[PDB]
Amino acid sequence: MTTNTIMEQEARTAPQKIAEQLLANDAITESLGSVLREFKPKFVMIVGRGSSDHAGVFAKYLFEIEASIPTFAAAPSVASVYGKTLKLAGGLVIVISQSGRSPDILAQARMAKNAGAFCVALVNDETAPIKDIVDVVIPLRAGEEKAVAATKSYLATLSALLQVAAKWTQNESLVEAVNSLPQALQAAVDAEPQLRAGSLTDVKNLVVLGRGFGYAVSKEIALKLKEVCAIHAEAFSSAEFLHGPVTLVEKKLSILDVCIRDESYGSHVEQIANVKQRGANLIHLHQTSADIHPRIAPLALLQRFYIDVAAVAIALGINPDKPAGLKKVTQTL
Amino acid sequence: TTNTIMEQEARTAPQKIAEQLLANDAITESLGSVLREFKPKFVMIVGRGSSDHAGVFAKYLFEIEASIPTFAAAPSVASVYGKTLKLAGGLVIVISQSGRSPDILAQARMAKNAGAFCVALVNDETAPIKDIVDVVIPLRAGEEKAVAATKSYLATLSALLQVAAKWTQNESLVEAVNSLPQALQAAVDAEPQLRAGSLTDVKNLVVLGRGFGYAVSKEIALKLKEVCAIHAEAFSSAEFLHGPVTLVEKKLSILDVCIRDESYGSHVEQIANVKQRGANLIHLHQTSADIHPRIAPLALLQRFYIDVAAVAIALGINPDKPAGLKKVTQTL
Ligand SMILES: N[C@@H](CO)[C@@H](O)[C@H](O)[C@H](O)COP(=O)(O)O
Ligand SMILES: N[C@@H](CO)[C@@H](O)[C@H](O)[C@H](O)COP(=O)(O)O
Ligand SMILES: N[C@@H](CO)[C@@H](O)[C@H](O)[C@H](O)COP(=O)(O)O
Ligand SMILES: N[C@@H](CO)[C@@H](O)[C@H](O)[C@H](O)COP(=O)(O)O
Ligand SMILES: [Mg+2]
Ligand SMILES: [Mg+2]
């Protein structure tokens, strides 16, 4: 252990907290799976903000590939600004929020409920008012997240999503992934650090490249780089990065590679090799063990990153548990 | 007033779109009736680059005017993971200027096999996409020779607006579409809004917008990277306060996309907040305050394309052939 930050401490508790969540939520997720197999959602909409939006992106890849059901993030403004009600009959809406207090999220949830959608909430604060809007609540059980930059609550969200998907689809491979998840996270905590501040010193802008599930995690990494290091980081698809943004490479760009060993490995590696040939300076992040389930590695890579980024934060003089001008509960419309 | 191909193409947009809307009236009328019969449960937009940002615009357009959930597809599910989805009863719109990238043809194929209704907004009418989808809506922008798209993006948004007008039959959208050419020409004739001096020595900036303004902010950020080599990133003014605002405690350059629609009040309040937190702001307003609110973003973008070609040339970048970029990019 290096920094004395609340963030690192919370990150290191994530594996046990996730184990406890899967135990406590096995029954509720079994029942949600049985409800969903009968209901047959036409689509899945994800309401979030912050790291809960990035979690929504992960859920998109998860449910499209494992459940074959189109999944997307909602745009709060349609409800909260334009006062519009969408046609959501027969759709599944999942509200994601550690705090469950933001007005625009609560407005979207309420509108979705009024539209006849089935509404599921992944919440960490059981006392949040979201519980009075949604149909079923799945508690994240991460306990209170005191640092401003989320760690344990994000991992708890992805595990809840994975567990819901495992129970719903009953794909035994996904079931195996969720069952192995606590051990893969613990292994990730115990591995050697992967990211160090020295690689980032004098870097004010960055591009994070990933593919598929790796892209979903990349969105969260760029946020933490912005949130706790004041580095303008941006997440891209390694496929979509070559449709315009690669010109930034020619201006000496610093790219962080989220290499996840799932079925998008060969394409991602080939795209990264192309970008390398185009002259970029690459920092490679990877899952900590090559003996992890392809669906669980995204989370293993994130565990290591959260611990190592707390130290990069402290090294750059930023306090990751109280970043400048930020709050744990952020409220917008 | 540079002699770049980008600027020449950008300045033809009002006339090209005027011809397009008339030429596409019959096909969009029929598509409208078909969609009113079909009753799509959702809309899925397949694109990459400026065709994705156009997809974001389509999301706001169809959700607010048609109450139908709209979202961008993830190509990789089909192309990299080889997975298919259940799209029976859904509308799929493939948007692509070239219509040739393998990742979008793969997604289009999978969507068609899943029973989705497939519409293509394409500029090359001799492109593979026409052999997959159920209907092609020609963008009619003419040949786009510069690498950074201008007329073809506005033509995409005009086609989307016309399709929405025909489907919903909302009298307001009909008035907006009829007024579109005049608003684009007015935007071209207006005073420049973005000047190179504001960008000198700026390597990274954030474009903040809300609703339709956000959809256009994504395109603006893309053009700033592709054409000024500036690491620009677009955010919702609501979503910026959930993390990235820490970047404002460092001196950070923010481009304000200010649309006068239902979003105006909240967005302005967010822009004022970031200003108080010390950001350095460059304001991009609509060029006329009597333009229809649903076509205001196109007028602002129209002005931006002309201004940004000159910013590029002033920044020493050739906007017609950016460093290491082709007009047709294929990634799978
Ligand atoms: N604290 C930030 C994450 O590190 C922030 O982006 C946060 O996730 C956002 O405000 C959403 O919070 P919620 O999940 O409690 O709704
Ligand atoms: N889908 C995300 C972008 O990739 C998200 O930031 C999105 O822009 C946001 O949901 C928009 O919210 P708004 O409509 O309330 O601005
Ligand atoms: N929705 C967009 C991001 O805001 C889009 O660029 C997206 O990231 C892309 O379509 C993902 O492509 P992939 O599934 O092939 O990685
Ligand atoms: N030409 C670029 C935009 O100016 C690029 O981002 C482009 O939009 C992308 O490669 C997709 O091309 P398409 O629209 O022809 O499919
Ligand atoms: Mg495309
Ligand atoms: Mg927005």
Report the length, in residues, of chain B.
332
Quote the tokens at residue A107: 């407005």
Q: Candidates B235, B236, B241, B242: which one to mutate for ligand 1, based on the most atoms within 8 Å of Cβ?
A: B242
Report the length, in residues, of chain A.
333
> The tokens 């941006």 sit on which residue?
A234
For chain A, what is the radius of gyration of the CA atoms?
19
d(CA B141, CA B159): 11
The amino acid at B294: R
CB nearest B71 (choices: A51, A65, A72): A72
Residue of B nearest to A70 (CA): B85
Phi–psi pair at A328, nearest 5 degrees? -65, -50
Closest CA to A53 of A86, A19, A15, A95: A95
d(CA A11, CA A33): 29
Quote the tokens at residue B233: 């990133």
> In this structure, which ligand is nearest to the CA of B209?
6
d(CA A66, CA A169): 7
d(CA B9, CA B154): 11
Q: How close A178 comes to chain B (CA, Å)? A: 20
Give helix B151-168 / helix B13-23 axis angle, nearest 10°: 30
Beta pairing partners, B282? B255
For chain B, what is the radius of gyration of the CA atoms?
19
Neighbours of A134 (CB within 10 A): 24
Indicate which of A64, A97, A148, A203 best probes the interface with B, i.e. most B CBs within 10 Å of its own CB: A64
Query: Secondary structure of chain A in the HEC alphabet?
Result: CCCCCHHHHHHHHHHHHHHHHHHHHHHHHHHHHHHHHHHCCCCEEEECCCHHHHHHHHHHHHHHHHHCCCEEECCHHHHHCCCCCCCCCCCEEEEEECCCCCHHHHHHHHHHHHCCCEEEEEECCCCCHHHHCCCEEEECCCCCCCCCCCCHHHHHHHHHHHHHHHHHHCCHHHHHHHHHHHHHHHHHHHCCCCCCHHHHCCCCEEEEEECCHHHHHHHHHHHHHHHHHCCEEEEEECCCCCCCHHHHHHHCCEEEEEECCCCCHHHHHHHHHHHHHCCCEEEEEECCCCCCCCCCHHHHHHHHHHHHHHHHHHHCCCCCCCCCCCCCCCCCC
Q: Would you tell me which CATH number, out of the four given (3.40.50.300, 3.40.720.10, 3.40.50.1220, 3.40.50.10490), belongs to the domain B189-315? A: 3.40.50.10490
Chain B residues 160-219 with a CB less than 8 Å from chain A: 203-204, 206, 210-211
Identify the DSSP state of B191: P
d(CA A305, CA A56): 19
State whether the Cα torsion A36-A37-A43-A48 is positive or negative. positive
Neighbours of B55 (CB within 10 A): 27
Give helix B151-168 / helix B50-66 axis angle, nearest 10°: 20
The amino acid at A295: R
The amino acid at B142: G
What's the CATH class of domain A6-190? alpha beta
Give helix B13-23 / helix B25-38 axis angle, nearest 10°: 60
Alpha carbon B236 to its chain centroid, in Å, reads 15
Neighbours of B130 (CB within 10 A): 15
> How many CB pairs lie under 8 A apart between chains A and B?
204
Beta strands in chain B (DSSP E): 43-46, 70-72, 91-96, 117-122, 135-138, 204-209, 231-236, 253-258, 280-285
Inform me whether the C-beta atom of residue B272 falls under 8 Å from chain A C-beta atoms: no
B147 Cβ closer than 6 Å to some ligand 4 atom: yes
Beta pairing partners, B117? B91
The amino acid at B41: K
Are A23 and A81 contacting, i.e. CB atoms less than 8 angstroms apart?
A: no
d(CA A7, CA A151): 7
Side-chain-facing half-sphere of A12: CA atoms under 13 Å:
15
The amino acid at A173: S
Are B210 and A77 contacting, i.e. CB atoms less than 8 angstroms apart?
A: yes
Could you identify the atom of ligand 2 that is nearest to the CA of residue B238?
16
Are B73 and B87 contacting, i.e. CB atoms less than 8 angstroms apart?
A: no
Side-chain-facing half-sphere of A77: CA atoms under 13 Å:
22
Domain edges within chain A: 6-190, 197-316
A323 interaction partners in chain B (CB closer than 8 Å): 246
The amino acid at B52: D
d(CA B43, CA B61): 11
Side-chain-facing half-sphere of B146: CA atoms under 13 Å:
24
Phi–psi pair at B124, nearest 5 degrees? -85, 110
Q: How close B237 comes to chain A (CA, Å)? A: 9
CB nearest A263 (choices: B81, B243, B244): B81
Give helix A51-67 / helix A152-169 axis angle, nearest 10°: 20
Residue nearest to atom 7 of ligand 4 (CA): B49
Instruction: Give me the sheet containing B204-209, strands edge to edge.
Output: B231-236, B204-209, B253-258, B280-285
Q: How close A105 comes to chain B (CA, Å)? A: 11
d(CA A76, CA A54): 15
Indicate which of A72, A98, A204, A205 best probes the interface with B, i.e. most B CBs within 10 Å of its own CB: A72
Q: List, in order, residues 6 or more apart from A54 with CB less than 8 Å away.
A: A154, A216, A217, A219, A220, A223
Query: What does each C-alpha distance from A63 to A28, A310, B73, B280 come to in angstroms?
Result: 19, 31, 13, 41
d(CA B297, CA B203): 25
Inform me whether the C-beta atom of residue A232 falls under 8 Å from chain B C-beta atoms: yes
Query: What does each C-alpha distance from B164 to A48, A89, A322 come to in angstroms?
Result: 27, 21, 46
First-to-last C-alpha distance (Å) of chain B:
38
User: Does 3.40.50.300 match the CATH number of domain B5-188?
Assistant: no
CB neighbour class for B160 (10 Å; exposed up to 12, middle 13-18, buried from 19): buried
A234 Cβ closer than 6 Å to some ligand 2 atom: no
Distance B95 CA to ligand 5 centre (A): 5
Are A148 and A27 contacting, i.e. CB atoms less than 8 angstroms apart?
A: no
B106 interaction partners in chain A (CB closer than 8 Å): none
B24: left (phi over 0), alpha (psi -120 to 50) or beta: alpha
Query: What does each C-alpha distance from B274 to A164, A324, B15, B205 come to in angstroms?
Result: 39, 13, 38, 13
Query: What does each C-alpha distance from B28 to B24, B64, B136, B290 come to in angstroms?
Result: 6, 19, 10, 27
At the second CATH level, the architecture of A197-316 is 3-Layer(aba) Sandwich (3.40)
d(CA B233, CA B80): 26
Experimentally, the structure was elucidated by X-ray
A247 Cβ closer than 6 Å to some ligand 4 atom: no
**Which run of H or of E encompasses B216?**
helix B212-228
Are A22 and A167 contacting, i.e. CB atoms less than 8 angstroms apart?
A: no
CB nearest B86 (choices: A68, A212, A262): A68
> The tokens 């909302």 sit on which residue?
B170
Distance B323 CA to ligand 5 centre (A): 21
Are B50 and B222 contacting, i.e. CB atoms less than 8 angstroms apart?
A: yes
d(CA B151, CA A160): 45
Beta pairing partners, B281? B254
Which residues' Cβ are closer than 6 Å to ligand 1? A 49-52, 97-99, 102, 105, 148-150, 227, 330; B 242-243
Are A148 and A326 contacting, i.e. CB atoms less than 8 angstroms apart?
A: yes
CB nearest A82 (choices: B49, B64, B82): B64
Closest CA to A112 of A129, A92, A136: A92
In 3-state terms, what secondary structure has residue B34? helix
Query: What does each C-alpha distance from B139 to B11, B20, B327 come to in angstroms?
Result: 16, 7, 17
Fold matches, B5-188 and B189-315:
yes
d(CA B230, CA A245): 10
Inform me whether the C-beta atom of residue A265 falls under 8 Å from chain B C-beta atoms: no
Alpha carbon B311 to its chain centroid, in Å, reads 20
d(CA A212, CA A202): 30
Chain B residues 278-317 with a CB less than 8 Å from chain A: none
**Which run of H or of E encompasses B111?**
helix B102-113
